[PDB]
Subunit: 253 residues, 4 copies
């Protein structure tokens, strides 16, 4: 099943979509600069692009680390990105009360991995009718994603994306199970599946590339990143696009 996000088609048999941007929204000028760079590079390569950032980082390394600009300013910055570049945007939500005001600006809203089984948040997100990105917790198997999907469906929303972020592997390490993509496709109605390569990785550039190419080889709707340096983005995306283009060009069976 494909999902339309403005003029983008997102789907497991469609050209990959890049979801990228910054960690925490901290100012208008810096956000617009970064977004501009992603926009120019993805336009040059013909890669569909959705800008990502958090306005309210709920899990901070220390209490008093800056959470971001907050809801009211964060949504203004997202409106300005949409106005200036004409692209969709994505951001996470942490409380039921945030769902409506965030959904009425942001094209995709995201269920954080830690909150993925919090029924009240699922229902509130569902009721927006927006496109939803579900972050797979690292302790949840791919066959348990169906239960989360089922709850969204019960609440009346089937515009769901599944986002792989790796699985707990002993202490501290994560491993990405390349077979979990297919399990999620088979058990969840072939909803779009995207791969968060960044938060799957605890030099690092050779690693992120190897992992991103391996996951995209399995036929995915998109790639989700934060840890990549901005100027090397083009070389990186050239390689992902080469592989995606090859894979998607071949029939499934």
């Amino acid at each position: 099943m494909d999902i339309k996000i403005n003029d983008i088609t997102l789907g497991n048999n469609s050209p990959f979509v890049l979801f990228g941007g910054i960690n925490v929204l901290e100012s208008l000028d810096s956000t617009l600069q970064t977004c501009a760079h992603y926009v120019e590079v993805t336009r040059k390569l013909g890669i569909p692009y959705i800008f990502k950032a958090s306005f309210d980082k709920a899990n901070r390394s220390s209490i008093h680390s800056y959470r971001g600009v907050g809801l009211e300013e964060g949504l203004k910055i997202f409106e300005k990105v949409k106005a200036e570049f004409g692209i969709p945007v994505i951001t996470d939500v942490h409380e039921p009360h945030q769902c409506q005001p965030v959904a009425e600006v942001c094209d995709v809203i995201q269920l954080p991995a830690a909150l993925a089984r919090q029924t009240d948040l699922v229902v509130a997100m569902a009721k927006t009718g927006n496109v939803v990105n579900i972050k797979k917790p690292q302790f949840l198997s791919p066959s348990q994603m169906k239960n989360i999907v089922e709850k969204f469906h019960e609440a009346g929303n089937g515009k769901l994306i599944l986002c792989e972020r790796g699985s707990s592997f002993g202490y501290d390490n994560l491993v990405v199970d390349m077979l979990g993509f297919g399990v999620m496709k088979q058990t969840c109605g072939n909803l779009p599946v995207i791969f968060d390569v960044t938060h799957s990785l605890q030099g690092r550039r050779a690693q992120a590339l190897d992992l991103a190419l391996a996951g995209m080889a399995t036929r995915l709707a998109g790639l989700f990143l934060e840890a990549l340096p901005l100027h090397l983005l083009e070389d990186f995306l050239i390689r992902i696009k080469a592989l995606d283009d090859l894979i998607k060009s071949q029939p499934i069976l």
Copy 2:
């Protein structure tokens, strides 16, 4: 470091405290009845006891499933338990705004494992000044518990309990690492460590298993245990025998 909860001393070198009760609060009468049974059994064995229940089930089977009595009715039930039995109580909280009104009634407030890194909830719980039970997520190593402890300390609360619930082991399965208890004691200032044997097993009759696992964990020297046939009694008799032996040996 010991923590006093009314007349109970909770600590890794003190007689173990049992934290037990029911999953979700459903009614006053059922709750009082269940509590009464725990109270009678723990009193006759001489085991300190804290009653546990949730007022709200945050992860439901269907969007349509009983959520439990809710905050307002849940707190009235807890007030009734405290009045009738004179024991401390423990419950979990899911949102920052709930922390203050819950902490007015409940002796121990509990940080759910899924929410253990949600900074706002941590701060709001810390600011109550109450005793806090931190549920260790199954994807977090024991050496990371110090980072949660550090946050509570910055927010001005050091009355923390660490609660082992098992570690992810492949898909849909847990294992308890018996060495994690000592790692948490060493790296977190010897705060009380308790063992949630029940959640540690939900992925695996089951009575032999819970006993084996509880005895094994309590052999490592812990502050507490978190969970016609008299099954609770027979179980606690054996835990207390081991706990008493282990606590009588020098460190």
Copy 3:
């Protein structure tokens, strides 16, 4: 570092080599038939090929379970394969005393995963001077592979291939860490690394799975692929499967590191 196996160049930046064949040697006719099919398919696709089979099942669930042809009969079958097709062959060895007579016939000899730390077998394999395929145990991390490599080097043999077969993941399940390939390459002198996709899946239709997993691994830039098929992928699907692996391998190998 590349390794030459007759006319084949095996290396992490060379076109991938297929190591394939059957699980256990059962009959001479059935072996020649299966091999003939692998040979015809790989030749048409321009994929270098090494024929694989075991002459003995060492590890079966029952003491009476069928174990195969045995050493003496197995080596006569391997000689026949080499004579008829002119290709290299690969087989596993289980005891030190077998290494020399097996190495006299088989181009590549294979250290089973369960025996990978058995020092007497390592030393006897190393002393043959043959190319060795090391099966990475499922309990060994990729950074510990260097310790096995070090032992072969200590015993005077550096013609070593590292073969990924998946990692233990809870009870009775495996996961393939796509990053372990690059860890092996960096820590083991960039020796050829190959992927045994088949054993990596035996704990999990299955054709879609093997393809996804094989593609994902080969995306990381590997010297080869190691698999089984039965009359295990069905033998008839081999061509379509390899067409896809080769398309990806060719794309990946054409990009610079």
Copy 4:
């Protein structure tokens, strides 16, 4: 099911048996000296004791690490340990042809974890009729131990001990699943189960150090009611006092 090893009863309901000694046999005098220390400490505490060592250690971390005095001298040293102290002994075998001559002298023979599914070794060990200690591989679940047991039974030997060593847990680390003991007991006819605490720990890093760890882990395993404790290469006495306290408590109580 209990197993008699001379005058020792090994069983999940019997006082625990200690299996310990040295890593590799090097010389008669040094072996006797070490064994004499284990013997004096275990006699003083009333703990049954089986001396362990390798004569040809086949899995050492270097190819030139000493494997031991070898089969002929190793067995002579074992005979002397038996004659001098009157205790049973245990050693590991890695090749089929070694099983018979080893079993002439060593009371218990041990199947290395890595070789546990190697059918030819299993059969050759079974055929000795001796007591066998099966080391559980770290990549094998406790419910797969029944398949190893079945093969020994098929080959005509039921005097089997199951030895826990931990399970793979991510890369490098091992974790001991305290529920695996009960699974092995339920599925394998309640054969004796012993715990190799040492192996279970060597992958683990660093007020306590490794001694506090080995003690915590040993006590946790013995709390599940086990036939014995198995150690690898004044502290032994203090350690055994604490294990014995717990073992005595646990074994004094009925199962159910």
